[PDB]
Amino acid sequence: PKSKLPKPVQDLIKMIFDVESMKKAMVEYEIDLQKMPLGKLSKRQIQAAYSILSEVQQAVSQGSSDSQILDLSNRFYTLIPHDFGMKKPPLLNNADSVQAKVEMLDNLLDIEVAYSLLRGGSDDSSKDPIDVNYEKLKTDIKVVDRDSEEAEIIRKYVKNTHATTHNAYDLEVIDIFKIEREGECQRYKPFKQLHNRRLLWHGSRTTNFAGILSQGLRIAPPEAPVTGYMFGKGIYFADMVSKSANYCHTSQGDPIGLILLGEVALGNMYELKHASHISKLPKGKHSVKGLGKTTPDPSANISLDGVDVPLGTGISSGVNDTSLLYNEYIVYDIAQVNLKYLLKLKFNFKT
Numbered sequence: 030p031k032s033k034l035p036k037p038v039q040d041l042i043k044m045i046f047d048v049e050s051m052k053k054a055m056v057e058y059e060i061d062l063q064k065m066p067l068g069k070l071s072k073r074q075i076q077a078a079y080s081i082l083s084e085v086q087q088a089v090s091q092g093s094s095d096s097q098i099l100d101l102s103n104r105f106y107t108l109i110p111h112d113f114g115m116k117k118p119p120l121l122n123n124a125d126s127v128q129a130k131v132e133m134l135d136n137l138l139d140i141e142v143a144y145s146l147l148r149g150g151s152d153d154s155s156k157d158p159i160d161v162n163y164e165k166l167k168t169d170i171k172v173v174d175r176d177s178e179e180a181e182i183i184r185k186y187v188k189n190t191h192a193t194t195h196n197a198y199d200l201e202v203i204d205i206f207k208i209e210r211e212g213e214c215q216r217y218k219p220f221k222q223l224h225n226r227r228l229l230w231h232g233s234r235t236t237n238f239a240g241i242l243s244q245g246l247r248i249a250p251p252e253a254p255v256t257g258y259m260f261g262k263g264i265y266f267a268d269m270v271s272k273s274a275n276y277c278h279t280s281q282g283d284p285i286g287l288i289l290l291g292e293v294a295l296g297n298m299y300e301l302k303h304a305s306h307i308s309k310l311p312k313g314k315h316s317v318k319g320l321g322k323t324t325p326d327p328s329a330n331i332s333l334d335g336v337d338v339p340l341g342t343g344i345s346s347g348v349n350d351t352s353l354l355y356n357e358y359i360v361y362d363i364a365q366v367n368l369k370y371l372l373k374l375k376f377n378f379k380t
């Protein structure tokens with residue numbers, strides 16, 4: 030059975046549902062596949078790990094000793110078995126180590142969604158599994174003509190917003206997809222006319238895109254420690270392609286990555302220079318903007334389908350004493366995002 034989908038779409042489907050890629054991500058995080066196989070992942074186990082990780086975070090920040098931290102750290106390694114043989118696991122005694130485990134759980138959530146999609150549903154050998162797996166995304170995916178104005182605008186956005194501090198690689202756009210998740214347009218209606226709507230980047234491991242397409246971008250679950258995210262539990266975006274592209278976690282051994290373009294209803298922005306692990310926005314605020322030292326040239330903004338595209342070259346923002354080299358944007362209501370495009374990127378590493 031041969032699928033009728035365009036070849037770029039078929040290859041995309043194979044990328045996101047690649048089971049061996051899910052295993053490789055788990056191994057990359059040091060998880061013990063024998064004790065925690067991909068098929069044994071569950072959301073409740075992940076949430077329990079989140080909760081334990083919160084206790085470690087509270088102990089770490091409140092200034093505890095390694096003896097007091099030891100029991101809390103060991104508890105986390107019980108819920109998520111790691112591959113350390115018969116040696117004691119590394120102690121989670123500092124905020125950086127705890128942060129790494131927060132990031133691991135974030136990725137396990139999307140992997141569990143992807144595998145759950147593959148192992149659910151029906152099996153029909155008369156259909157092409159590419160077609161079967163495509164239908165599980167509840168997302169309409171179309172290839173954008175390379176000569177369309179959409180493509181030129183998107184390519185210029187990629188070409189102009191690569192940061193100098195991310196010059197270990199440059200980006201080649203292979204395929205541009207126009208994506209429409211079922212029900213997302215309806216969910217976006219209260220914000221579709223809001224001011225300060227921008228087209229922003231969101232990169233992520235390829236293993237997270239089956240979950241992102243079928244369920245959309247989500248906020249971290251209630252069990253996740255809010256102190257594990259620089260601006261709290263929201264959905265994070267960038268206006269520099271390279272800043273988002275770094276979160277694809279590509280390498281010489283895997284140079285193909287995926288990145289999202291989404292219309293984000295920012296509205297009135299809460300502008301911050303340093304970490305603020307907030308639960309809600311102040312009254313009247315719709316989003317947070319981490320103020321970067323560098324910003325795309327404001328005068329170079331253009332309009333695509335009524336949405337501002339900040340594709341200008343990077344220049345100084347005039348903001349002093351900030352923790353961020355480049356901007357980032359956070360919304361705390363999943364309804365404020367309307368995904369528009371998905372790009373397949375080739376990373377040419379210059380190292």
Ligand SMILES: O=C(O)[C@@H]1C[C@H](O)CN1C(=O)c1cc(Cc2n[nH]c(=O)c3ccccc23)ccc1F
Pocket residue numbers: 135136230231232233247248249258259261262263264265266267272273274276356357358
């Ligand atoms: O993606 C997740 O793991 C988490 C959990 C849940 O999916 C929601 N989520 C985030 O949106 C999230 C992402 C980052 C990384 C990041 N920071 N800044 C950027 O500009 C940026 C641009 C593109 C891709 C990533 C980034 C940090 C904290 C977060 F909450």
